[PDB]
Amino acid sequence: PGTVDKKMVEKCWKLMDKVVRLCQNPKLALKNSPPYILDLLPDTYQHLRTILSRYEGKMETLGENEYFRVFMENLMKKTKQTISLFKEGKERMYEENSQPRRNLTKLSLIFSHMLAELKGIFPSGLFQGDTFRITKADAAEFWRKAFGEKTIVPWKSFRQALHEVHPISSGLEAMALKSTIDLTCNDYISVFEFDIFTRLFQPWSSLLRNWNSLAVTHPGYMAFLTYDEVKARLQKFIHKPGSYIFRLSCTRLGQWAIEYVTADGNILQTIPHNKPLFQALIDGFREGFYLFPDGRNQNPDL
Amino acid sequence: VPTKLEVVAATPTSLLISWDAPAVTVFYYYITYGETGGNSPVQEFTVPGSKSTATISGLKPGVDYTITVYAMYYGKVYSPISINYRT
């Protein structure tokens, strides 16, 4: 997209600071979830200024890199939508249950995702997207072969590319995939979002099918939640030991989370470091912990 | 599952459908409208999760259509809801 100039990021910081003016209303009573929204934009400003410090000798060469253009354009768009969200919401920002508040927390999740992506691509303010390490080789082979040194791609190229290895049945499904694989919500798949996805749904050989069972037709799957929201969900089935869910954490991308209820009535969690998600799910089915997904008696087969 | 789906504004060709926001979050809503008993592949479009209302234009006047609505979280398709309207 558009070439990067320093004045526009001056504008951008004014917007982030203005969103900070909006959100710092205590009447919102924001919880540090996270995503806190408030804390992420100071860290975004700070890390961006770190990139600038690193690129003081060659500002123009940084402005002609695709990733910085796409990322900045998207940050300006999302923060403008964050202002116009309060604009539309008006007073209904004072209660969390209201819809504009939910949209605010949605954009908080997004902001957390974008910062995470920027820190992944820019460690110490330096571009290493071209030398980005994809975790599962099979995924790294696919990415080096289909695109190569590319850091970011348009979603259309990724749909047409991934479709050749793992076919996509319909636009109904392709939209659902573009949901997860594009965490930034900017029609651009990066090596960061791709690597997170592949680590989340190993192995590669049945990647798309791994996506289907573990995400689409699964009841226990809860996408992104915080420990507060998880306990709020399982409080309704606390008396029922073995009722479990599994979710994702913004704090940790590309890592799984599993929550389940014990006979004591305490809600204890587990994380699958070893074994993939499905295998660990099966094993917990054999042990006697993962019995009811979301307090539902029918348990899917893996 | 979007709750309490209904059409609230009607023209021969354009319909305003309003469903209530689910308690759970919605990243995006997916809508597929198609001719009742029509072999033609249904038309489809998407809206952001903030909206509770959507408008369809270009529907032929004098047809009963079947409209299906999906809620979408990240890698998640909640169960849909459907309505049929005669224009």
Curated annotation (Swiss-Prot), chain A:
Changing K240R: Found in patients with acute myeloid leukemia; uncertain significance. The chain holds residues 48 to 349 of 906 of the full protein. Ca(2+) binds at D182, T184, N186, Y188, E193. Phosphorylated on tyrosine residues by ALK, EGFR, SYK, FYN and ZAP70. Phosphorylated on tyrosine residues in response to FLT1 and KIT signaling. Phosphorylated on tyrosine residues by INSR and FGR. Phosphorylated on several tyrosine residues by constitutively activated FGFR3. Phosphorylated on tyrosine residues by activated CSF1R, PDGFRA and PDGFRB. Phosphorylated on tyrosine residues by HCK. Ubiquitinated, leading to its degradation via the proteasome. Ubiquitination is negatively regulated by IFT20. E3 ubiquitin-protein ligase that acts as a negative regulator of many signaling pathways by mediating ubiquitination of cell surface receptors. Accepts ubiquitin from specific E2 ubiquitin-conjugating enzymes, and then transfers it to substrates promoting their degradation by the proteasome. Recognizes activated receptor tyrosine kinases, including KIT, FLT1, FGFR1, FGFR2, PDGFRA, PDGFRB, CSF1R, EPHA8 and KDR and mediates their ubiquitination to terminate signaling. Recognizes membrane-bound HCK, SRC and other kinases of the SRC family and mediates their ubiquitination and degradation. GO terms for cellular component: cilium; cytosol; flotillin complex; focal adhesion; Golgi apparatus; growth cone; membrane raft; perinuclear region of cytoplasm. Its main location: cytoplasm. Changing S33D: Abolishes interaction with ZAP70. It comes from Homo sapiens. 4-O-phospho-L-tyrosine binds at R247. Residues 129-201 are annotated as: EF-hand-like. Residues 1-302 are annotated as: Sufficient for interaction with EPHB1. Residues 1-128 are annotated as: 4H. It is found in: Cytoplasm; Cell membrane; Cell projection, Cilium; Golgi apparatus. The RING-type zinc finger domain mediates binding to an E2 ubiquitin-conjugating enzyme. The N-terminus is composed of the phosphotyrosine binding (PTB) domain, a short linker region and the RING-type zinc finger. The PTB domain, which is also called TKB (tyrosine kinase binding) domain, is composed of three different subdomains: a four-helix bundle (4H), a calcium-binding EF hand and a divergent SH2 domain. Forms homodimers; IFT20 promotes the formation of stable homodimers. Associates with NCK via its SH3 domain. The phosphorylated C-terminus interacts with CD2AP via its second SH3 domain. Binds to UBE2L3. Interacts with adapters SLA, SLA2 and with the phosphorylated C-terminus of SH2B2. Interacts with EGFR, SYK and ZAP70 via the highly conserved Cbl-N region. Also interacts with SORBS1 and INPPL1/SHIP2. Interacts with phosphorylated LAT2. Interacts with CBLB. Interacts with ALK, AXL, BLK, FGR and FGFR2. It is linked to Noonan syndrome-like disorder with or without juvenile myelomonocytic leukemia: A syndrome characterized by a phenotype reminiscent of Noonan syndrome. Clinical features are highly variable, including facial dysmorphism, short neck, developmental delay, hyperextensible joints and thorax abnormalities with widely spaced nipples. The facial features consist of triangular face with hypertelorism, large low-set ears, ptosis, and flat nasal bridge. Some patients manifest cardiac defects. Some have an increased risk for certain malignancies, particularly juvenile myelomonocytic leukemia. Residues 1-302 form the Cbl-PTB domain. Keywords: Calcium, Cell membrane, Cell projection, Cytoplasm, Disease variant, Golgi apparatus, Membrane, Metal-binding, Phosphoprotein, Proto-oncogene, Repeat, Transferase, Ubl conjugation, Ubl conjugation pathway, Zinc, Zinc-finger. One of its GO terms (molecular function) is cadherin binding. This protein has one functional calcium-binding site. GO terms for biological process: cellular response to hypoxia; cellular response to nerve growth factor stimulus; cellular response to platelet-derived growth factor stimulus; cytokine-mediated signaling pathway; DNA damage response; male gonad development; mast cell degranulation; negative regulation of apoptotic process. This is E3 ubiquitin-protein ligase CBL.
